[PDB]
């Protein structure tokens, strides 16, 4: 549930050298902040496999603090498909957009034996406060029969918050 990694600071020191050093360059920012940071690559991978902009990484870093960062971009260099830079978005309480994973819970839920599961989105974008952060979203919907398409408000909408809308869309259907 709680993902801590590390961080450090940098000013000079070409990212070519850092990257050559096993250390993944990146930046740290929010409304109130911008700062150059680097992390260990191997460290970051193990976390990011798991974390993955769905979950909060609390950083740490020296002058030890703990910053509620979301990761909002990863730049991989296309040739080797390995990340060449990350930028960490630090939370503080203002409503903020993000991607919350979806959990489809149930049986085929209608037209069983057999339908089409057909998940349109693996995630969803939701305007949410830093304080209450809905680490996943329950989707049951006993049907879901032939010709039905789930939009938005047909979704759980955890007690924390509202959507990033537009409410008219599709998540699952059976054809």
């Amino acid at each position: 549930m709680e993902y801590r990694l590390k961080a450090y600071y940098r000013e000079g020191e070409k990212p070519s050298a850092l990257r050559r050093a096993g250390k993944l360059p990146g930046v740290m920012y929010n409304r109130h902040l911008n700062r150059k940071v680097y992390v260990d690559l191997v460290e970051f991978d193990k976390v990011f496999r798991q974390a993955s902009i769905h979950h909060v990484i609390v950083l740490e870093l020296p002058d030890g603090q703990s910053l509620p960062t979301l990761v909002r971009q990863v730049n991989l260099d296309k040739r080797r498909r390995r990340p060449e830079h990350v930028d960490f978005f630090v939370l503080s309480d203002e409503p903020v957009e993000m991607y919350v994973p979806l959990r489809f819970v149930g049986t085929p839920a209608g037209v069983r034996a057999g339908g089409v599961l057909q998940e349109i989105h693996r995630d969803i974008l939701v305007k949410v406060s830093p304080r209450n952060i809905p680490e996943f979203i329950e989707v049951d919907v006993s049907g879901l029969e032939i010709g039905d398409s789930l939009h938005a408000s047909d979704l759980k909408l955890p007690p924390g918050v509202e959507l990033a809308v537009s409410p008219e869309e599709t998540i699952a259907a059976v054809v």
Partner: protein, 141 residues
């Protein structure tokens, strides 16, 4: 055989193979993918030799995505060569494929099943490949 319907110009210049880049590249549609290690013109008749290798392995099952497309016209001079008079005579089409791009990219199949199909699929290709899975790094979007 893929081929654009309704082209704007038949016969376009060759142009270079530089600079492995430009989209594709992150595995947007499926559970596993074939990524280009080297640049090439890959031929429609090559793409379909890959497509069929795989649908054959799924026994018409699975889902297959392709994701490179042959829009680049390939010309040729009849045999009978002599340089001049004109340019002449489109044979096939190619898609230009530089490194790090995902072609093909299956889904809805067991891992070792797809990984065997993609490996076959790869031998039909002129360049070297890499098989991949999918990632946090392939983000969300």
């Amino acid at each position: 055989m893929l081929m654009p319907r309704r082209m704007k110009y038949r016969k376009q210049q060759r142009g270079r193979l530089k600079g492995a880049t430009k989209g594709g590249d992150y595995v947007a549609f499926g559970d596993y993918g074939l990524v280009a290690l080297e640049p090439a013109w890959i031929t429609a008749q090559q793409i379909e030799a890959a497509r069929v290798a795989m649908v054959r392995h799924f026994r018409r099952g699975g889902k297959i995505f392709i994701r490179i497309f042959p829009d680049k016209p390939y010309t040729k001079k009849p045999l009978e060569v002599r340089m001049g008079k004109g340019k002449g005579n489109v044979e096939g089409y190619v898609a230009v494929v530089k490194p790090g791009r995902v072609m093909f990219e299956v889904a809805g199949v067991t891992e070792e099943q797809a990984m065997e199909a993609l490996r076959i699929a790869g031998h039909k290709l002129p360049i070297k490949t890499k098989i991949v899975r999918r990632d946090a790094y392939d983000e969300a979007q």
